[PDB]
Amino acid sequence: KVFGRCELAAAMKRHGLDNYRGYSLGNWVCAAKFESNFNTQATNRNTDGSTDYGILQINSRWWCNDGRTPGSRNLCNIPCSALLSSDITASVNCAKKIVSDGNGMNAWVAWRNRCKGTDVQAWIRGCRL
């Protein structure tokens, strides 16, 4: 599924991401923008033989297992296939543990390159939330 921007903004508000850990909603919508392009099906194979999965591109080395990543620690306790869903629940709840891992939203490099320090509110503007 390719979310539209305000559609994703409304589902993330419902899943409790707004101000979760001090990070307002825009940060989250913006992250899925530059990680997935709002695509729940997005996957990318990385050169360590790990894979990044779903709307927030969660990495198979640390968070989910997929049977073909060496040393997968499966910290969210879920198969990676769960994160490729239309329903953003699995990814949201694994996002919540990730953001709580010590480094806040700095875990997501696309977030760090394109959203951090910018006016991230803009991404929920014109969404009538």
Partner: protein, 118 residues
């Protein structure tokens, strides 16, 4: 790059020692830390158990950590290496690189000689 000081340490029975690791300038998080050693009279490397005589301090602001071992005997002789671990939500090649790096190592010798103290 992971900087481990010092390179060698020689101590008498009963002393203690500090190995230090420093994760030299980077954006990458110190998410956790492993200590390993190769016993004297062995070429196989095993992991250390934090607790008891093995005091670890981790300072992730400064991206540093250290292993203190109290009350040495000849059983603590060997080579000691730290390895850091840096976790990221989505893939960062820079931080993945870091999970393959060990400290330089510290060769540690404990003398048990007669009439020899601290």
């Amino acid at each position: 790059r992971v900087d481990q000081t010092p390179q060698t340490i020689t101590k008498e029975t009963g002393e203690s020692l500090t190995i230090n690791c420093v994760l030299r300038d980077s954006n990458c998080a110190l998410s956790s830390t492993y200590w390993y050693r190769k016993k004297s009279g062995s070429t196989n490397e095993e992991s250390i158990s934090k607790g008891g005589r093995y005091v670890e301090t981790v300072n992730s602001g400064s991206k540093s950590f250290s292993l203190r071992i109290n009350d040495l005997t000849v059983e603590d002789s060997g080579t000691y290496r730290c390895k850091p671990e840096s976790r990221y939500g989505s893939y960062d090649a820079e931080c993945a690189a870091l999970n393959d790096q060990y400290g330089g190592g510290t060769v540690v010798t404990v003398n048990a000689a007669a009439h020899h103290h601290h």
